[PDB]
Design a protein around this ligand. Structure first.
Ligand SMILES: CCCCCCC[C@@H]1S[C@@H](CC(=O)N(Cc2ccccc2)Cc2ccccc2)C(=O)N1CCCCc1ccc(C(=O)O)cc1
Ligand SMILES: CCCCCCC[C@@H]1S[C@@H](CC(=O)N(Cc2ccccc2)Cc2ccccc2)C(=O)N1CCCCc1ccc(C(=O)O)cc1
Ligand SMILES: CCCCCCC[C@@H]1S[C@@H](CC(=O)N(Cc2ccccc2)Cc2ccccc2)C(=O)N1CCCCc1ccc(C(=O)O)cc1
Ligand SMILES: CCCCCCC[C@@H]1S[C@@H](CC(=O)N(Cc2ccccc2)Cc2ccccc2)C(=O)N1CCCCc1ccc(C(=O)O)cc1
Lengths: 270, 270, 270, 270
């Protein structure tokens, strides 16, 4: 029901609004150069990384970076802090998903467990441009080279995230559309331990129709955006696929490396 | 354009029908479909094979289980052949798509170079069911169980592909439907090295359009099929990466076997 | 380039076969293995000894235990003679080796002058077993015991070769493996009195890269065989020195035997 | 896995680092004096020789040279003074290679028994440049020709060593590299009195895999640095025995010459 779909739509909107602070909307208004209430303090090298330690809030080893826990570490054990934060919001927005919180207790988790990372890169896009990506609330702009120049491992960590973002953003999906896309993802139903599935599908349908008319409407010209959009999902897989294989490395190679429970539990290889 | 979408959809059925031997139709009839006609022989256990292997139109090596390849190695080195074939089938077909042949020969090489697999794993499905799969012109039937009983690298090869058929075939798609879905696979347009993506997406779109109306007209009581059937290429793409991982792996596991040369080159890998 | 390697192998294999009539495959077909075909006349005692040459395919002297020469010596002398044929064999296989002839002869000789012995014990390793050693076209089999009961500086010369063997043999290597293994020795590059090592050193590396891919291939389950192998040019390097000890030790014995000249020459000592 | 491999090594390095004092790196500092910090005090003859006993703590005689003990013996003992200490480090280190102590006691010792020397000559290498060898905690220095003149025996009890050092050094391997090749050494598999080897073997294989990768990574240009480095494994033994056999002489030649607790036990011909 159209009238019920705009409802469904609009319904997921405010939620996304209330579960996530850095909307694509704000995150884009901190990337262009137009308004300069406060632009993003940019990070491109060490002098700046450090300079941004004072200018920006980085509750980590302020002075050196080498001998007392190298930086890539602090820069990596950083995302993992934002991380916890993501699943916080993410899960939250999932709580609001129509009928979602009804399904098997065991499954909801699964849904979150996986779809949480896939959703992390979905969002993440609106956070970056081909010059770099914003950090800590978009209160800063870490450059693409700064990262690219890092230690043998982590060094390739993000570089493979732009090609996706660049393209994903190229569809020009505003906020109003994201939430529902963030909705579908979650109600996938093709995950391990998926106890009872048809329901998660009945839901995902609700949100596949909804989201559908949202593109047509919100993007009259964006012919085939839906198909185009749903397609992106594969992109998001490999990325999550690959990412994992990294934490697969990193930890059995960084055994002092801690890991918050929500992550400890979603960080499940394969 | 409706009517035009109507004919495109037919255009492709015809050709597909002409470029493709074992269809989902005739397969079904044979598989889970009764039609107790010219039923196939079955392989349910290692010997049950040998004691059947001599009962079919193969072409390469006789039943030699000692210093002459083991079941495993011979069944895969058999897919390859068959795949190698359908490659041309998908090729001749591809040469029937509106505007295709008009593409640059490099992209035509590309479009085909990657989508072939996806095309393949999708069609393999018209021969699968939870229990097994058609073999040798579907003149036989390999069991998911039997197959499961094979050498270490090969054992869990189909198990996860089998899962796909489950979900893919769950859509109960008919040939006229696969006919376009398969056309979309060829002109995916995101492939590496395409030098003219404009047109490749121009056609494809006219195909997503053509597809949609199809899935509609023939499945009026099943919404989001299109959007479902679409959000399936990620499963395929997923498989694609597996094959090429469960394979590259075998490269440095069967190189000594440089007794493949001309047959090894006539095949290469895909 | 793996293609390059996979062939160098068969090339050298070929030549190992063409150059070396008796192989392991056979020194094994008649050794402990069965194939009960051309059973090797055994020598367990001094008594069987004399009763043997009157049947053994030897060419020169008869089992003259009528105050005509003495056994041990006689049984030793039969070795050095063998090795002389050996050298021919090996001196030929040498030619098969990539640009082994493009090197200054003031090295080619050396390489052979020094390697030869090693290649002599490496093959002997295949003619034995914890229980003995094949003799005369393997058309015979001297015991591990009988030889122990031999004269003062003789009844305890091979033991180490046996002690050795075992180990080596345990790599269940095949002549196709050994071909390449032999090659790598020849171009040992660390031979004293070398003139232009560069080329040599280069080749042996190619060889080393061929051998290495071999074991990886030929033997898929046994890592570090390659290493467990290069750890063997050492034992051989030792055993070789035995060959000297008894020799410069033999001088003080079989010497005044001036009814030898053009024979103690044809064989000299190496 | 390359993950578990780049780790063993990493572990194996600090070990080396925290066990063996003067490193190859710290050493190559001294030898290449483009610095001033604390240059060595070189001994090029008796003239100079009696000066190290001024700025250096030469635990040996300074007044008269022959009667109340001569110079060669006054050095040799000094050589084997490090020996006892050579024990320490490795012995200490030995207990760091995973699964070491986990072996049957006796067997443990064996690895130490013999391998205790090959490392020594391995570690002495980094100590010496074509022109000589550092001595006394890297402070003092003892020339080649200086030692090349000593009493009849010792006279050349180093010349051949240098050669090896000279040649070995050229592997341009560092401590990361060594530590492992030091681990592989101890972790033999062909020692006189090895009850249970499959284990020893299974352990080295591990160190050997680590090693392999380590060399690639660190020396991407260094073609075959592996095989080559393993080749040296032979070389080290020649010297060993030669030291072994010429340490004999000095024994029955100099009957009062003692052989501190440790040394004796790890000293045995054959
Ligand atoms: C070594 C490899 C580094 C990898 C990439 C670094 C950029 C990330 S991206 C951004 C948001 C986010 O994490 N995401 C998800 C994500 C997951 C995987 C990969 C990359 C990004 C998106 C998010 C934002 C907004 C809403 C929802 C979700 C952020 O604040 N980042 C964290 C860095 C903060 C600054 C810092 C620097 C130095 C120090 C110090 O000197 O100690 C301390 C702190
Ligand atoms: C060891 C691991 C592999 C396991 C899977 C095997 C199933 C296939 S399914 C069928 C068609 C096809 O080839 N495909 C290709 C494919 C398969 C698996 C994965 C990916 C792609 C499906 C297809 C049909 C139509 C069009 C496109 C593609 C077939 O003939 N099969 C091939 C085997 C024939 C039997 C045989 C056995 C031994 C011997 C002997 O040596 O003596 C003789 C005959
Ligand atoms: C004295 C101590 C014992 C020494 C070992 C004796 C057995 C050898 S082992 C074998 C191979 C070989 O020679 N080699 C060389 C080698 C082995 C060990 C050490 C040094 C050198 C290896 C070879 C084989 C294949 C290819 C290349 C090289 C062989 O034909 N043998 C030759 C002897 C035949 C018997 C005989 C005895 C007496 C009389 C009589 O009544 O007059 C006649 C015949
Ligand atoms: C006549 C025999 C000559 C033999 C070789 C001499 C060089 C050695 S090398 C070095 C340490 C070491 O032993 N090695 C190994 C070794 C083994 C075999 C041969 C040669 C060297 C290095 C090592 C350390 C720790 C671990 C592993 C390896 C050292 O301090 N050296 C000892 C001499 C110190 C100076 C000295 C001289 C004169 C006087 C006096 O007149 O008062 C007093 C002291």
């Amino acid at each position: 029901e159209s009238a019920d779909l705009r409802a469904l739509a609009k319904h997921l909107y405010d939620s996304y609004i209330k579960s996530f602070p850095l909307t694509k909307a704000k995150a884009r208004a901190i990337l262009t150069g137009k308004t300069t209430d406060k632009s993003p303090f940019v990070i491109y090298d060490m002098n700046s990384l450090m300079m941004g330690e004072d200018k920006i809030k980085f509750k980590h080893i302020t002075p050196l970076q080498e001998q007392s826990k190298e930086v890539a570490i602090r820069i990596f054990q950083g995302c993992q802090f934002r991380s916890v934060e993501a699943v916080q919001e993410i899960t939250e927005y999932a709580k609001s998903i129509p009928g979602f919180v009804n399904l098997d207790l065991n499954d909801q988790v699964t849904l979150l467990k996986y779809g949480v990372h896939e959703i992390i890169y979905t969002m993440l896009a609106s956070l970056m441009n081909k010059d770099g990506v914003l950090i800590s609330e978009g209160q800063g702009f870490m450059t693409r080279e700064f990262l690219k120049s890092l230690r043998k491992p982590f060094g390739d960590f993000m570089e493979p995230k732009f090609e996706f973002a660049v393209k994903f953003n190229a569809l020009e999906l505003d906020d109003s559309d994201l939430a529902i896309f963030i909705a579908v993802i979650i109600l996938s139903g093709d995950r391990p331990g998926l106890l009872n599935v048809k329901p998660i599908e009945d839901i995902q349908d609700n949100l596949l129709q909804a989201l559908e008319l949202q593109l047509k409407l919100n993007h009259p010209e964006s012919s085939q955006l839906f198909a185009k959009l749903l397609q992106k999902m594969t992109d998001l897989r490999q990325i999550v696929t690959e990412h994992v294989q990294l934490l697969q490395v990193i930890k059995k190679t960084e055994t002092d490396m801690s890991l918050h429970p929500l992550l400890q539990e979603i960080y499940k290889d394969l």
